Design a protein around this ligand. Sequence first.
Ligand SMILES: *[C@@H]1O[C@H](CO)[C@@H](O[C@@H]2O[C@H](CO)[C@@H](O)[C@H](O)[C@H]2NC(C)=O)[C@H](O)[C@H]1NC(C)=O
Ligand SMILES: *[C@@H]1O[C@H](CO)[C@@H](O[C@@H]2O[C@H](CO)[C@@H](O)[C@H](O)[C@H]2NC(C)=O)[C@H](O)[C@H]1NC(C)=O
Ligand SMILES: *[C@@H]1O[C@H](CO)[C@@H](O)[C@H](O)[C@H]1NC(C)=O
Ligand SMILES: *[C@@H]1O[C@H](CO)[C@@H](O)[C@H](O)[C@H]1NC(C)=O
Lengths: 48, 48
Amino acid sequence: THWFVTQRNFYEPQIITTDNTFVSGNCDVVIGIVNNTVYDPLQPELDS
Amino acid sequence: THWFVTQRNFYEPQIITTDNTFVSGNCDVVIGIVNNTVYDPLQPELDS
Ligand SMILES: *[C@@H]1O[C@H](CO)[C@@H](O[C@@H]2O[C@H](CO)[C@@H](O)[C@H](O)[C@H]2NC(C)=O)[C@H](O)[C@H]1NC(C)=O
Ligand SMILES: *[C@@H]1O[C@H](CO)[C@@H](O[C@@H]2O[C@H](CO)[C@@H](O)[C@H](O)[C@H]2NC(C)=O)[C@H](O)[C@H]1NC(C)=O
Ligand SMILES: *[C@@H]1O[C@H](CO)[C@@H](O)[C@H](O)[C@H]1NC(C)=O
Ligand SMILES: *[C@@H]1O[C@H](CO)[C@@H](O)[C@H](O)[C@H]1NC(C)=O
């Protein structure tokens, strides 16, 4: 039910964040792309 | 006219930001260094 990012050769699940992923293109080009939520670690720092 | 950062094996121009570059030394040492503007994605998040 949940999506994670882990190193290729060892299962170690991490919360998908903007510090773990990079942005390129959009959803209309990538084949098989799935909807999820990406955590921004800067957002609750501004809110707090 | 504009400066970009791209991967060396495939042209894909990106806006020069602090998340694409690292800081080391100053302008008085590097030979051939040029003037440009480095974008900070943190600044408009604080301003807004
Ligand atoms: C992932 O989410 C996007 C955006 O919420 C979905 O794209 C929308 O899908 C609805 C229903 O199919 C359409 O009526 C809208 O026109 C779409 N909006 C956009 C921006 O294209 C997309 O369908 C979702 N993917 C899945 C499989 O749930
Ligand atoms: C890049 O910009 C810097 C700073 O704006 C320039 O530094 C100036 O250089 C002139 C001539 O050498 C000096 O007289 C000034 O004192 C410098 N100004 C400042 C604010 O330090 C620099 O010349 C520019 N480099 C290029 C390649 O034009
Ligand atoms: C994978 O293949 C199945 C066919 O068995 C298809 O229904 C599905 O959409 C495919 N998914 C992707 C991401 O290609
Ligand atoms: C590059 O070569 C030109 C000569 O065509 C010279 O004017 C310029 O100063 C040189 N720049 C560097 C960084 O070597």
